[PDB]
Amino acid sequence: GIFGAIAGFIEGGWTGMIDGWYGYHHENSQGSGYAADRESTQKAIDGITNKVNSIINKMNTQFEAVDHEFSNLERRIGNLNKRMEDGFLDVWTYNAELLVLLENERTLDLHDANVKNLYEKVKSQLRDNANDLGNGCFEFWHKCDNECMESVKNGTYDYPKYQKESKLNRQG
Amino acid sequence: GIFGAIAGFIEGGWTGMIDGWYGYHHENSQGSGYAADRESTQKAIDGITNKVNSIINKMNTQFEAVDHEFSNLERRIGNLNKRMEDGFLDVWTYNAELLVLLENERTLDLHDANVKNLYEKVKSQLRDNANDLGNGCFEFWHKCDNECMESVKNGTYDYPKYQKESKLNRQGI
Amino acid sequence: GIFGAIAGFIEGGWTGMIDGWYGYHHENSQGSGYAADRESTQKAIDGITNKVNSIINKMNTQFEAVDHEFSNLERRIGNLNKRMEDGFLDVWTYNAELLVLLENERTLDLHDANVKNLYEKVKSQLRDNANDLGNGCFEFWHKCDNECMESVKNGTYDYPKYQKESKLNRQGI
Amino acid sequence: PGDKICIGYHANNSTTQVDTLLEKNVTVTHSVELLENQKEKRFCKIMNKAPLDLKDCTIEGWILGNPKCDLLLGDQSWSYIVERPNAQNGICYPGVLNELEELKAFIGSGERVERFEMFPKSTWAGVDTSRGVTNACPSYTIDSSFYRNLVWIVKTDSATYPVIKGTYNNTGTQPILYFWGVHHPLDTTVQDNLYGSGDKYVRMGTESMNFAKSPEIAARPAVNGQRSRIDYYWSVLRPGETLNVESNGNLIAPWYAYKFVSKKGAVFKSDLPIENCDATCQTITGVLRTNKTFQNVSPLWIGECPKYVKSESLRLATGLRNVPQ
Amino acid sequence: PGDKICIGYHANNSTTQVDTLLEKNVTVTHSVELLENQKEKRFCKIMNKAPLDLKDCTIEGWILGNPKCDLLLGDQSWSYIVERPNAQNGICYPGVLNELEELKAFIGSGERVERFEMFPKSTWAGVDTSRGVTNACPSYTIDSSFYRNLVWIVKTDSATYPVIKGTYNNTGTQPILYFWGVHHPLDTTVQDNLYGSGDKYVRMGTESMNFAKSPEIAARPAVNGQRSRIDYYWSVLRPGETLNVESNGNLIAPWYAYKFVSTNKKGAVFKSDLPIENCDATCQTITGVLRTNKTFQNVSPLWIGECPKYVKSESLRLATGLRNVPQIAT
Amino acid sequence: GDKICIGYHANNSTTQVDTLLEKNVTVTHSVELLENQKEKRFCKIMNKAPLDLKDCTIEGWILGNPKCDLLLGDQSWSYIVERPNAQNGICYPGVLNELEELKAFIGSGERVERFEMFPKSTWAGVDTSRGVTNACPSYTIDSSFYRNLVWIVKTDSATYPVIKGTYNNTGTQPILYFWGVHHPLDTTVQDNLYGSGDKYVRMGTESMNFAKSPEIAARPAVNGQRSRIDYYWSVLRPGETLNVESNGNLIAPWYAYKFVSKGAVFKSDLPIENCDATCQTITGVLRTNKTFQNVSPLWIGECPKYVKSESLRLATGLRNVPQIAT
Ligand SMILES: CC(=O)N[C@@H]1[C@@H](O)[C@H](O[C@@H]2O[C@H](CO)[C@H](O)[C@H](O[C@]3(C(=O)O)C[C@H](O)[C@@H](NC(C)=O)[C@H]([C@H](O)[C@H](O)CO)O3)[C@H]2O)[C@@H](CO)O[C@H]1O
Ligand SMILES: *[C@@H]1O[C@H](CO)[C@@H](O)[C@H](O)[C@H]1NC(C)=O
Ligand SMILES: *[C@@H]1O[C@H](CO)[C@@H](O)[C@H](O)[C@H]1NC(C)=O
Ligand SMILES: *[C@@H]1O[C@H](CO)[C@@H](O)[C@H](O)[C@H]1NC(C)=O
Ligand SMILES: *[C@@H]1O[C@H](CO)[C@@H](O)[C@H](O)[C@H]1NC(C)=O
Numbered sequence A: 001g002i003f004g005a006i007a008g009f010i011e012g013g014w015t016g017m018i019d020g021w022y023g024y025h026h027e028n029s030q031g032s033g034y035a036a037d038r039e040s041t042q043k044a045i046d047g048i049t050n051k052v053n054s055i056i057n058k059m060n061t062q063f064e065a066v067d068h069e070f071s072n073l074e075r076r077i078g079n080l081n082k083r084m085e086d087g088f089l090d091v092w093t094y095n096a097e098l099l100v101l102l103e104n105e106r107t108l109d110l111h112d113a114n115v116k117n118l119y120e121k122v123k124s125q126l127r128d129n130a131n132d133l134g135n136g137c138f139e140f141w142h143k144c145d146n147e148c149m150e151s152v153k154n155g156t157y158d159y160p161k162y163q164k165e166s167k168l169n170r171q172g
Numbered sequence B, C: 001g002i003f004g005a006i007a008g009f010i011e012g013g014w015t016g017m018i019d020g021w022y023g024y025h026h027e028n029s030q031g032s033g034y035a036a037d038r039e040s041t042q043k044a045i046d047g048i049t050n051k052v053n054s055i056i057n058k059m060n061t062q063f064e065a066v067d068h069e070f071s072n073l074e075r076r077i078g079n080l081n082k083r084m085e086d087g088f089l090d091v092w093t094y095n096a097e098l099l100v101l102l103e104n105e106r107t108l109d110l111h112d113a114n115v116k117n118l119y120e121k122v123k124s125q126l127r128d129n130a131n132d133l134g135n136g137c138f139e140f141w142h143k144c145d146n147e148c149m150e151s152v153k154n155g156t157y158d159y160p161k162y163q164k165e166s167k168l169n170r171q172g173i
Numbered sequence D: 001p002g003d004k005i006c007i008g009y010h011a012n013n014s015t016t017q018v019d020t021l022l023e024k025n026v027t028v029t030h031s032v033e034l035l036e037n038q039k040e041k042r043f044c045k046i047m048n049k050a051p052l053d054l055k056d057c058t059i060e061g062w063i064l065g066n067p068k069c070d071l072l073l074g075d076q077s078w079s080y081i082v083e084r085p086n087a088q089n090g091i092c093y094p095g096v097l098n099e100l101e102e103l104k105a106f107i108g109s110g111e112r113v114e115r116f117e118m119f120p121k122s123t124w125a126g127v128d129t130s131r132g133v134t135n136a137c138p139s140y141t142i143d144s145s146f147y148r149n150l151v152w153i154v155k156t157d158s159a160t161y162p163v164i165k166g167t168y169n170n171t172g173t174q175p176i177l178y179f180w181g182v183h184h185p186l187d188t189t190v191q192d193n194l195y196g197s198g199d200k201y202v203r204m205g206t207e208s209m210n211f212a213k214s215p216e217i218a219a220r221p222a223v224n225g226q227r228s229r230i231d232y233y234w235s236v237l238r239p240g241e242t243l244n245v246e247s248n249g250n251l252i253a254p255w256y257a258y259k260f261v262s263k264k265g266a267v268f269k270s271d272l273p274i275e276n277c278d279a280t281c282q283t284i285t286g287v288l289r290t291n292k293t294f295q296n297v298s299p300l301w302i303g304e305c306p307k308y309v310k311s312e313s314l315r316l317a318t319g320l321r322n323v324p325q
Numbered sequence E: 001p002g003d004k005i006c007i008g009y010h011a012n013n014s015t016t017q018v019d020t021l022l023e024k025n026v027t028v029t030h031s032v033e034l035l036e037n038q039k040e041k042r043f044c045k046i047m048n049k050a051p052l053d054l055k056d057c058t059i060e061g062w063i064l065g066n067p068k069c070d071l072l073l074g075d076q077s078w079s080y081i082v083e084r085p086n087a088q089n090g091i092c093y094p095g096v097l098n099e100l101e102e103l104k105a106f107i108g109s110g111e112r113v114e115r116f117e118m119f120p121k122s123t124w125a126g127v128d129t130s131r132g133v134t135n136a137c138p139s140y141t142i143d144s145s146f147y148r149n150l151v152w153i154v155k156t157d158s159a160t161y162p163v164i165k166g167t168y169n170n171t172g173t174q175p176i177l178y179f180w181g182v183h184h185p186l187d188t189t190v191q192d193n194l195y196g197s198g199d200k201y202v203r204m205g206t207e208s209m210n211f212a213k214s215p216e217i218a219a220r221p222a223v224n225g226q227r228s229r230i231d232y233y234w235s236v237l238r239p240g241e242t243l244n245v246e247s248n249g250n251l252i253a254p255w256y257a258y259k260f261v262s263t264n265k266k267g268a269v270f271k272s273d274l275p276i277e278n279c280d281a282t283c284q285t286i287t288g289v290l291r292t293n294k295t296f297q298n299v300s301p302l303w304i305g306e307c308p309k310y311v312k313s314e315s316l317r318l319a320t321g322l323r324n325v326p327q328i329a330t
Numbered sequence F: 001g002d003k004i005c006i007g008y009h010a011n012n013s014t015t016q017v018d019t020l021l022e023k024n025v026t027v028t029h030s031v032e033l034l035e036n037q038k039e040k041r042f043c044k045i046m047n048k049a050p051l052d053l054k055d056c057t058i059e060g061w062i063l064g065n066p067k068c069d070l071l072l073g074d075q076s077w078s079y080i081v082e083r084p085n086a087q088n089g090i091c092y093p094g095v096l097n098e099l100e101e102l103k104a105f106i107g108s109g110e111r112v113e114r115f116e117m118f119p120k121s122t123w124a125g126v127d128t129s130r131g132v133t134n135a136c137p138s139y140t141i142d143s144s145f146y147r148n149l150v151w152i153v154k155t156d157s158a159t160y161p162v163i164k165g166t167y168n169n170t171g172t173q174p175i176l177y178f179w180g181v182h183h184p185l186d187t188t189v190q191d192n193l194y195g196s197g198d199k200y201v202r203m204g205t206e207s208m209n210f211a212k213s214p215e216i217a218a219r220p221a222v223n224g225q226r227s228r229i230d231y232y233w234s235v236l237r238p239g240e241t242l243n244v245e246s247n248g249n250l251i252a253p254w255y256a257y258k259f260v261s262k263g264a265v266f267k268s269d270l271p272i273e274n275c276d277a278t279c280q281t282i283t284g285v286l287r288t289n290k291t292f293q294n295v296s297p298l299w300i301g302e303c304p305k306y307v308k309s310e311s312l313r314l315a316t317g318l319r320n321v322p323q324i325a326t
């Protein structure tokens, strides 16, 4: 993928995460699970929704094709009307199809970017208290509670609190 | 924001930095202030300006609408004229409107990219000689006079020079 | 460059790397050289070709102008015919020209991001088992085998295996 | 061994694909189809208004008063017109309806017409108005008949045909669509028989219109057993305008005329049925009942329709690329 | 407590917004409006040449020489034409000017005209030239008169209207726009009185053109007190071409005509009642002057000169600066 | 220590593309999409040669100007080339009515067969052979007429009787035919050529009516003629029937064409040579695989789209930044 997270350094998606586009998976002595980041998922939904209605609103005008009759001394204006109506047809067909190909390309990268920025956000919180694996997963250098896991997702993670304990096992 | 720096992990902007788009805020014993990074705001200005110029150039033809009269045995060609003119007006309104929505989205991305890159640049220099607070701010694990600050901004920071100080200060805390 | 790698924090391209767009330069006691990353080069090639093909297919209709003549009583329809044909001509030239400028901006971005992403893939593997010189280069704190180079490339670098040799050197300094 | 937190992204059972500039056939978790490719094959009321089914009559047959078209004879209101393609009842007595294409365009720009007697037969003095019938224009009931809107005026059993005169002063607020003709006999004998001798003219004028025509006698190929011809004409009397009519022969007088009321008009040539359904978007090949922005069905339609384009599919990815395990 | 360096971006007092595909009403620090909505409700000289103001005359009234249009009577140079919506003085003796839409088109394109006597009254022999007047076409100063570029020719007291002939050879470098007509009496009574009895015709030819009309006698609705009609006609006599006129009756003859100069402009005729002033403009729309650097224009599709491309849009503001997030004070 | 580096490709390329942000940008690889080069001659399309009307205009050809005999007979063409300086057209002065519509109808064809529609014996009691004019010389004859028309004149002693003809189409193909109406300059000529009194020309079919009478007057001399002829054309539909009736001034159909039905008519100077094209513009042959062309919007066959651009180059490779060497 283009930011490199999706079909990239995070090799696959999660059939398990049902409530959001972008999310967290955690494992600890108490269990394992999936949880969506409500903020960025909702941020994206509003984004995409806006894009889709922007496109629909702009495609709102239609061209009138008329099918008036032409006599047999009117071959030139009959032909002119046909080339005219087919010219506008060709332009709108091109507009619509091209807009869809480009927009699909950009919507995919948006999702890739948002995932990447989620990973950085956590990485930025944890620092040396955790080992960052290739695949977007962090291994804690300390025992992480459900409170601690939840503080990571909330963005309220207390780094100094675990720094010592992490230093030790990092040394073991 | 898409690169996540602007109104992202860097929460707000500086009304005080007045000489450029992207910049450094510094604080030290010698004092504090705002300095715009000049190389990257300059490239941004060149590019945005060219983008604006390109659009103005490609939009510089005009479809001709005419004032001709039509008699009432000419309902069909007069309608043909009306639909022909409306047809191009609708096509151009669409092009101009979509273009601005799209370029506006991308130009805001570009700015987000330069802020993020400027921060990525500084971070890779400082390494563990500095402490990351949030919001794009770094706290030094050593003394950093003006000479040192310019050196970060210039791209020539001397990590080996201050490594021992920074490492001892860290242990101490 | 927008992701900042090309003509950026990696200041130059390698005329010596001729088998790919994106690559690795290694130097080791067993020799040195330039080696293209095949997977990301190939994917870039599939993508870019698809784009060229897609544009070619979307442009695959023609608007046909005509040879028709008009009497000295047919000035209004003659002029209608000209404004129509010049109108579709302007629309299609705009589309062509605008499309190329926009797709060139984004094809170069795409290349920039593939390089940047290759750079991140290696920096995250190496951690503090290597030192960041500038310009997209890393110097190992440990002896690196040809086999070690291959592990860093293909994605299977063994960090713990070298962490102690690396640390003894890192700050044996 | 350590606890782990991972960043990742949604997957699902989707097999729906999209196309991007860079890649084809990309399965995406969520998408939206913007293009409608389906239709009900029938014609329906539009603004809660039924269309005019011409049935076995062409537009020519209907507004002239072709005797086999009596069903359409009174007042009419429509949301669009359906002319069936093989309809057989049109111009019954062979001739040319001048500015036909233009007439067809004027009719479709309308929404309603009221029929009324513009010129009573008593208008023209000294001339018969009861003998104007032909075996070329037969109603279902009788072999010889004429358009219901015109009178074939003809010489009294006593010669001759004198100057006849009529005027109409449009006092209403609506434009008036009316018709008339000029007979073109195959022979000077038919000429003499039906009208006098001497040079015959049909002259008509309003405040903005001038008309003058004379008989053009010759024998054309037989059509409906007729080697004679009639040149038909149509015009429009504006609110506030007067019509003067004068002739000494060869004139098909206007008997009945339409008050005409004028949005987007449609005349649909098709064979689709007209059913009791209601609708908001009618195309010539059927009804669209759909929320989608784009349609591939037809360029020709009445009502609020999605834009027509030649594409088979316009799907926008909303969701991320779908890769499951 | 320690030394800080921070990375950030510009902000300001800007309250100007833009839309983007993903989000509406984004405030940005810098932007540029590409569309112009402002205009001056007036007509200004184009390429330093004043337009023709027809005042109370129509285009027909002007080039036929309606006697009340004498302020316009003569030579005129123009960069375009303005016709007032409620002009009273057009065609004053009822009738159709044939191919009128195509005449308006030709006139527009359409730079200057030099008036001149094409057929002097002596041209027509044995007929009367002094009686061609009607109460339909008063001048401001006489109750009865007639168009300035035409002669209404009537039979002399002897009740024979002779065949009359006219020739004009265009031995010049410019086309000549000229007019003539065919009178249509409400009567044979009037017909016999005005013209000789028996079949009548107006024929006219040039190297490439032919024309033949005969009178269509009929009583028609009264207009300007006239139940008779005149059928007006127009042609263009190309350089090096010759006109031959031949009538036996009912000819309204060409008298004066126009050397016509065709333009390198595009040409425009504006139907409008806006004022006309001593001012120069680069762009003239039908609803006003534009004076702008902008790329797109709100105001009109119809213009002469150099104008921005017309568009429906309310506004086309392009972001140039970044998202504006100034710090909150209280 | 041991180095590993990330980097990108560079090459000796000097081709530049443009970009919304940046103007003159050198790239490693790129594809030009526009063709600006043309062959400059007329060729065969679908292995069907064009028709060269040479010294004749469309009017001269199809009416049968005596000097146009080179083109007489059946013709099959892929497109028509009219030379701009062709001097052989309407020789006897007059108007060919609905000319533009006729030029458009012939343009829509690929083949005509010439055949005798009305044998001269059709018209009884008139002189069919006496009627040529010095306005229509052939190359060998000073006084001739169009090969598709018969100028019919009254027999040595007057008078000109009513004359009548019919043709039944019968066939699959439409018929294109022509006729005229003579307009003498004088009563004297009208009397000499035709009987005294009111004359008429009349023609009709199931769908069409014609009626005209002579407009007698002296027009300005054109090829020695102050008289005129009104020319006319029409198309007899397959199964339709034509009736012709006149007592004077008829310039009658003689020969007509069975016509077979996008085509073009190029007004140009270019030589027609022995070659094939798949794409032919009015200013030359295109032999390309490119998507856009700047040569011409007037063409036939399969041609790339026409735009007014000088170049449309489209970057496939990355920004080229080769290392400097002195
Ligand atoms: C039914 C009815 O009441 N209408 C007519 C009535 O129009 C007509 O009278 C004509 O009345 C007008 C004003 O309405 C003029 O007074 C006409 O006189 C003139 C004119 O137009 O000025 C006099 C002029 O000298 C004549 N011009 C020449 C050169 O001959 C013209 C000209 O002859 C006429 O325009 C030709 O139609 O007329 C006046 O005739 C009367 C007359 O028959 O009939 C009523 O029934
Ligand atoms: C955020 O994290 C804290 C623990 O630090 C937890 O107690 C709290 O409920 C969380 N808030 C939300 C919204 O989940
Ligand atoms: C990848 O790296 C491992 C370790 O270098 C090596 O054994 C392997 O051969 C390399 N990749 C392959 C198998 O292509
Ligand atoms: C996929 O999901 C939808 C809703 O979960 C469900 O209705 C459908 O059955 C599923 N598809 C399969 C595998 O049948
Ligand atoms: C026609 O009727 C209107 C009635 O308002 C009247 O004013 C007018 O004079 C009449 N016109 C004619 C020509 O009869």
Ligand SMILES: *[C@@H]1O[C@H](CO)[C@@H](O)[C@H](O)[C@H]1NC(C)=O
Pocket (backbone or CB within 6 Å): E019, E024, E025
């Ligand atoms: C923009 O925002 C303002 C309020 O912020 C609102 O009134 C308007 O509807 C929005 N839309 C436009 C005009 O862009």
Ligand SMILES: *[C@@H]1O[C@H](CO)[C@@H](O)[C@H](O)[C@H]1NC(C)=O
Pocket (backbone or CB within 6 Å): E169, E170, E171, E242, F220, F221
């Ligand atoms: C018109 O004048 C030209 C130039 O003198 C002359 O050659 C031509 O014969 C004249 N035409 C007529 C009809 O007199």
